[PDB]
Amino acid sequence: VVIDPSGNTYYNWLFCITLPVMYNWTMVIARACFDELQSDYLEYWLILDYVSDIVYLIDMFVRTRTGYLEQGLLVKEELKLINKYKSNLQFKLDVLSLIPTDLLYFKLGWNYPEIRLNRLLRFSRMFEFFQRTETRTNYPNIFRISNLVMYIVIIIHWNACVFYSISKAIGFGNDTWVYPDINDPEFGRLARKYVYSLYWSTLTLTTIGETPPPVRDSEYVFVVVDFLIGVLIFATIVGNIGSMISNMNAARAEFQARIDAIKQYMHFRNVSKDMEKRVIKWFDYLWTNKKTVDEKEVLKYLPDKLRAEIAINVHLDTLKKVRIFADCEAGLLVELVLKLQPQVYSPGDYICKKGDIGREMYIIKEGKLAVVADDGVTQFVVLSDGSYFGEISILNIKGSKAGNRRTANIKSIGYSDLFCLSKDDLMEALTEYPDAKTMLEEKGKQILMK
Amino acid sequence: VVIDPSGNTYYNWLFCITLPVMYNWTMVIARACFDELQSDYLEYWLILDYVSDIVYLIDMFVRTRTGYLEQGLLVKEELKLINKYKSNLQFKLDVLSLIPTDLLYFKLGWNYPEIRLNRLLRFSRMFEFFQRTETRTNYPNIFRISNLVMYIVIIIHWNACVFYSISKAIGFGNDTWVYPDINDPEFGRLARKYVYSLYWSTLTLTTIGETPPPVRDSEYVFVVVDFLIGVLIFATIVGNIGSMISNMNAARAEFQARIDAIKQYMHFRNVSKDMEKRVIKWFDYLWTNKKTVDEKEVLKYLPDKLRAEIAINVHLDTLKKVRIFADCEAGLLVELVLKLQPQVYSPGDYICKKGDIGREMYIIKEGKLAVVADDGVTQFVVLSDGSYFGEISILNIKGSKAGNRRTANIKSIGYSDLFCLSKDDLMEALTEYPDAKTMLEEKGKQILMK
Amino acid sequence: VVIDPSGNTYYNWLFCITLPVMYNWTMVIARACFDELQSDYLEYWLILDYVSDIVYLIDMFVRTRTGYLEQGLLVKEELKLINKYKSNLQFKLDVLSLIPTDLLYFKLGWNYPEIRLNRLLRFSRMFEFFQRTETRTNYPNIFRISNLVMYIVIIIHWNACVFYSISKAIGFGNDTWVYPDINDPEFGRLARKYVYSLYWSTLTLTTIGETPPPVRDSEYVFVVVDFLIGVLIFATIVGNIGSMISNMNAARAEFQARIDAIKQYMHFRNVSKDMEKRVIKWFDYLWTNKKTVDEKEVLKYLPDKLRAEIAINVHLDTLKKVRIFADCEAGLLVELVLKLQPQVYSPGDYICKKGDIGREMYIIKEGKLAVVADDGVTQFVVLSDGSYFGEISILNIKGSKAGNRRTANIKSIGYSDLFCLSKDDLMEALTEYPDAKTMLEEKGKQILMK
Amino acid sequence: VVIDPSGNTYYNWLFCITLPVMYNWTMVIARACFDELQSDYLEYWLILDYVSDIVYLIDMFVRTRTGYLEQGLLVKEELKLINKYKSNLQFKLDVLSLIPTDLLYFKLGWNYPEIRLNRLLRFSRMFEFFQRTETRTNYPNIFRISNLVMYIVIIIHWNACVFYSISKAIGFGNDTWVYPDINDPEFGRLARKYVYSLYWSTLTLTTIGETPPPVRDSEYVFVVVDFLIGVLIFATIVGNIGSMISNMNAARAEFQARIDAIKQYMHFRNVSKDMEKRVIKWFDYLWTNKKTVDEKEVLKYLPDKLRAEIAINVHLDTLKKVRIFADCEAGLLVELVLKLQPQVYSPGDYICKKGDIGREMYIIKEGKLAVVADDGVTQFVVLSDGSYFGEISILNIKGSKAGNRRTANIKSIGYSDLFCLSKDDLMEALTEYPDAKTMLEEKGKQILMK
Ligand SMILES: Nc1nc2c(ncn2[C@@H]2O[C@@H]3COP(=O)(O)O[C@H]3[C@H]2O)c(=O)[nH]1
Ligand SMILES: Nc1nc2c(ncn2[C@@H]2O[C@@H]3COP(=O)(O)O[C@H]3[C@H]2O)c(=O)[nH]1
Numbered sequence A, B, C, D: 001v002v003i004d005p006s007g008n009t010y011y012n013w014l015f016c017i018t019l020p021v022m023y024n025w026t027m028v029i030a031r032a033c034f035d036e037l038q039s040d041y042l043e044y045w046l047i048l049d050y051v052s053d054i055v056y057l058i059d060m061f062v063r064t065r066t067g068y069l070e071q072g073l074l075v076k077e078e079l080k081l082i083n084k085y086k087s088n089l090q091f092k093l094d095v096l097s098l099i100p101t102d103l104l105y106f107k108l109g110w111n112y113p114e115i116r117l118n119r120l121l122r123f124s125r126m127f128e129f130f131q132r133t134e135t136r137t138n139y140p141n142i143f144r145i146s147n148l149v150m151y152i153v154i155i156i157h158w159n160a161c162v163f164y165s166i167s168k169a170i171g172f173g174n175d176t177w178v179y180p181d182i183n184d185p186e187f188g189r190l191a192r193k194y195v196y197s198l199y200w201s202t203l204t205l206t207t208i209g210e211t212p213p214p215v216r217d218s219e220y221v222f223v224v225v226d227f228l229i230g231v232l233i234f235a236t237i238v239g240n241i242g243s244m245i246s247n248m249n250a251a252r253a254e255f256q257a258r259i260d261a262i263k264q265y266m267h268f269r270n271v272s273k274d275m276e277k278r279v280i281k282w283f284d285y286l287w288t289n290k291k292t293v294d295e296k297e298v299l300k301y302l303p304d305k306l307r308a309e310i311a312i313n314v315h316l317d318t319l320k321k322v323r324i325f326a327d328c329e330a331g332l333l334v335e336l337v338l339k340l341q342p343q344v345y346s347p348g349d350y351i352c353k354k355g356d357i358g359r360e361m362y363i364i365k366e367g368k369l370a371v372v373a374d375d376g377v378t379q380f381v382v383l384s385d386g387s388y389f390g391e392i393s394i395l396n397i398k399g400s401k402a403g404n405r406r407t408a409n410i411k412s413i414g415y416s417d418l419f420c421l422s423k424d425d426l427m428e429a430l431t432e433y434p435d436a437k438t439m440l441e442e443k444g445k446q447i448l449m450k
């Protein structure tokens, strides 16, 4: 065997089947409308159509060999897959899109390729590929815009073909509206035919209108309907363009809107230009160093038993340098990684101060912190990455003259990325295995006596 | 009896009255402006107008026979309904729209059907039908787009009629702007008249402008006003189109935006392509198997005493296979169905692990789980649908060497849809009837000894 | 005083000063550009300009006599108000807009009314009136759309005047782009002048372009700049139109989106058409009876000491029929009115059932409820409006064989609007005055014995 | 060293390098396409190009001398900065944009300035400056709109240059579509050349289309592609304009939407016009006095150890007049400034009333309050700014006949801005230092006895 739709093989086949479906959606109508296209390159159209039909058949086979999830397990029983396929509307659409209507080439002649129009009924495969690509691609907005542009181009191409067909029905050159006479040297070339039809279609759907006005009632009606199709469908698609660009700007726009609200508040309250500059510097840091997004709000949509792995694969850089995690229990790190709230501190920010509520443990992910003196400048100890502080005031200790108080003040030399671990959480998670707690308050007593 | 507006009969009548109202809104102005329309098909217009008026009268009768809610009860007293009708502005509008202005046909002649313009004053019924359909239809966006297209078409039709009337007032063919001379063979046909007027209207409201420029001051003024009506009203309607397409994409766009934020985080943090593929697979599963929507956020707008029934009608498939619910008390299932949080687990995800906080009971809705050994591969027990686990570590038990600990580790073979029932909730809800609890810890002791 | 800007007198004056400001913003540029406008109606323009200037002077006086809030109190000291006025930029703008530039009529002649262009510098007053109207009017969206239309019209009018001025500078009729020769009988009329200039302006700003193309470099540059002004500013304004219509649809669109999510869930889960019809009926009820909006989310932006008054003025209809409120303490009703959560129940919905957690007291605002038998049909007692139930299981009672249990089952005959009062809240709020509690458990014992 | 990108020097250099990048992005294509531009002002183009290249070199030097943050510290080691530069793609782009392609002037002649097209590869610097300006400027929306207008102008300019180049390739005047013959006196001027090309570009990108239709297939194709570029890219940019105006209106629109929901509720519930006027007055006050924004929601994105400084720099005006803060401990004010919830009370609003739950302490930021008698009018004490009340009923006091009760009723004479400090918070924060608490209940006893 089976294909496992989640796999890469299924996605690759989705591409390989979208190619014929897109080809069919673009070219069947073109060949049906522009007769010279069908006739001049008939030897190539036959090859391409037969290859497309072969790929359609192989796609039907793949649909027979693609497993589905019952009880969460991939069904691998062949006949079960055949039944699941045939019971779905997709099998009906596939049989309809693979009906050998090409036999009508013997009746209607080689000049009627619209018999292959049923081949469009595999559009679903194409759309599936798109909805898969949009999910799996690393450039979701580039692909989304390319998809919208493809839809625009297909719509304009189809409307060009429709215009040319209507000109044919009315008669080429019978009036100033229809496509001019084919017998003209310049206006008889297939290139000119298609490109002028596309020009007309673009002017009509984009509602520019710089085309000869209608002459007949059918022409007036078609032009009204087509200008309305233009207005509505092009507003739809080119406003989807707008929404895609909006969601492209979503993060940056939200960040900038927050900054603007802050600046409005500061200018209204006449906040000192010192503090205004400090705030602007904080936000410039958040942007430049790519910290505007908070991983919590993003990863909250992941499963906890997958967001856990995510956090591990991101923070194993530091949670191996820490003494508590991955050293004593070697598994405890998972119990708290999904609750280590990542904070960022500016240079000179006092994370801790003597005589404060010690309700948070900190793990230094990045940055240089200092166990300073209360004078403000004298740096007693420099804590680099992997260090952990703020854990002594969490625990119950014998001989602690300072209970629930910070034993020292910790300031940040530079921008520090820390993991604030709350006291309640450390309490709750160390209950399972105190084999790490013993050396934890080993460190605790050792630092509380000195 | 009375009609009970909530019923299907009332909605069917809403359709049956919207038909004449829509007919009147489309055709009265057309016949008033295009005199040949009124004259040539006068025998049909008379029949249709009289049928419309009869339906208007029957709609007034229905309004006299439609109950309203006082004290939440449907008023069935006839005279009370007559008073409620006559006291509402709707009765005034109905009498105004049913005034026999057709008598003016004897004074103004058969060439003045705008006397029936008062018939437009039942627009409310039409709109009511729409606002009912949008609520009750299964295709809300299809109907909404059809409604907007109907508004566009009606506006363009009315503007075409207005253009033709203005041409008539100025005189057909008196200058290049107005509709050409009626005496022309081609430009005198009612078909050509209406269709060219519609063409002009479309070019003006869509602001394409490929029409002969005005000549007189009245023409310049009307064209300015009409181009502005075009800009404003068509932006309104075709931007409502945009918002409707947006809300069509709302679920998919939110899902894809979450996926994009996740992928941005993973690529920025250089998350391993293993875990990136796992996350993409999780999201592909959520989409393909239609799990992107969380029933909680959707059904939270339902009444609890209706959302309860909803959850029952959805989850009675599994809550009959479970041993606790619908078996001992047979009514307890409602006390917890509105708090069974549905979770989804990937293949191989450890739902439970030995030596963890047993604070959640799980009911396997769909999927195969395994009571494995801690080695990781040896599957002791396979739990299929209807099974419940994680309930032993909830309860107070005699002789439990493992208190508040998982007696075994449960992993998911495939994608498991479970119902996580919190410990607090099971505690709170079993307090009412311990007739099920006794066999609950029957199972508890039986599994805790073996 | 003083005038007290919050008062109605200040708003009326805002209108009376917006009239000259709007007049000045519309007509000064018109008279400056269309010389015939200035000249032909000079006797009227002089009167209107002098009246506008008098009103400007009276507006300056009003600004001297309008109090401001210092320490939250309206300043009534005259000289303090004069200082507050003169210290503001508004005084500078007012003196600039009232500078007697009309004296230049003696130097530049009566054909130069753009000397009155400084009169536009009172635009602020106009805008203030708008921002006041939008706040105080009952039709905020009608006024907002009218304001946007006024901006559109003013912009188009100004661009028409600019086009005519540029034609004058280049010379009327010197090329096909500029306004045609004034000496023409038809193209020399002030009506034709202004209306064709407005036509050109509309075609340019709405970017239709059906105007003679530029000839000179200045004309090309102006047309480029004006088409870009068109694109940008008209997108701005006519997209503000879109956002205004969106916020017009905001409530209805949110309601309908909730209904659509519900229907999607129900159709996906194959919810029985019984329950689907019940849900659709619930939502039809919510809409038809105007219950889609929840007063909590709306009134949460009001002050509690004003939202309290709001809730009182709305619910004194029923909280006078209740026995506890406005009867014993006569003031207790305010302590709980801001926490009476309004619920709606469908016909047949069991609000209470025997043997359930009695943690909510209910006050029947509207609707008929029944104290039924557990059989389901036998109605023991019918509770109409003003009745209160679910209070016995809240209180501590002697001789209650049923503790924390519902003494009877309450069902809703029809759609009941109730006030669910939580047990914790009744406990917390009755602590202040048990003078009502005594008769509360009077009723309690009386019903608990029978 | 180093430059410290957060500093003002780096931003100034960002401007000084954006000037050549913008110059290059505007003029290289212009000179490449309009040959007369390159030739006539070659002496000036050479100077400007060499100055631009010198500034590019100095920008490369700056990039070598700009520190980056490792461990949150600004790297000042020269060679480390050289490595960080050369290891980034920016160094590749800078070397590519500074390659001396001007040497090709000796081969291709002075008429080929597109060899300087590589100079566009420093676009990043320009964009960086923009993203810095948008952050640091006080007019974020003005700058954003200016940036979008710059993008529009650059796109139109580039498309004008492209049109002129295509006309050159096809041949000037070979058909009606291309730019006319250069040999024409009027259509040969560089001014006319560029300005008509810009006119064509504006008509095409804004999709007005009032230009001669294409003649050749290449012209038709280019016009189709360019009209589509117009539609898509101009919708993008001029809808970004819409979103920028939306976020300009965001605060005012949210405020007005809240007011509209309130007014809809009041008119639907038939709220008395007294209370409707009171609510409208409250909202008029909120707007006029600039209180629609709540500093909590804005400043919650700031760091707590920066939002603290913000609140201090804003509220030190009053927290120096208070007796508790900045007087006894002199540091306690920071422990509670981030939890002082700012409330606003209308004139006559009873903040406190005798016999109520004293769970909030109030600090009068602005406004006159009264310790009144319960009669309602007799004002015992007038509390101005700096005063604090509601603190007696917070504390545990000996001899308090009124426990957890308000000792008096406090009403607001005028609009009072207060700081509501919750009881729990005062309890929690006074635990650290009771040196202020002693005089706190000094005041407490002193007022409780009298
Ligand atoms: N007092 C003290 N604290 C230190 C030293 N080195 C690291 N620390 C950390 O500084 C922290 C300050 O807050 P805590 O008292 O909670 O915990 C303290 C220790 O974790 C040291 O040498 N002396
Ligand atoms: N230990 C054990 N647990 C089982 C077995 N079969 C099912 N389970 C479930 O596995 C669950 C693991 O978590 P709990 O200990 O809370 O509850 C346990 C039982 O509900 C079994 O055979 N042995």
Ligand SMILES: Nc1nc2c(ncn2[C@@H]2O[C@@H]3COP(=O)(O)O[C@H]3[C@H]2O)c(=O)[nH]1
Binding pocket: C352, C358, C371, C380, C381, C388, C389, C390, C391, C392, C393, C394, C405, C406, C407, C408, C409, C410, C447
């Ligand atoms: N048992 C009983 N309850 C009644 C009667 N009339 C009204 N009620 C209300 O029905 C309510 C059901 O819930 P509670 O027991 O909390 O409170 C009960 C009473 O408030 C009655 O006649 N008998």
Ligand SMILES: Nc1nc2c(ncn2[C@@H]2O[C@@H]3COP(=O)(O)O[C@H]3[C@H]2O)c(=O)[nH]1
Binding pocket: D352, D358, D371, D380, D381, D388, D389, D390, D391, D392, D393, D394, D405, D406, D407, D408, D409, D410, D447
């Ligand atoms: N009773 C009384 N209260 C006063 C007086 N002056 C100020 N107050 C304040 O009024 C407040 C009312 O609420 P509290 O009793 O909590 O605290 C009271 C005091 O803080 C006074 O003279 N008498």
Ligand SMILES: [Ca+2]
Binding pocket: A207, A208, A209, A210, B207, B208, B209, B210, C207, C208, C209, C210, D207, D208, D209, D210
């Ligand atoms: Ca056009």
Ligand SMILES: [Ca+2]
Binding pocket: A207, A208, B207, B208, C207, C208, D207, D208
């Ligand atoms: Ca257009």
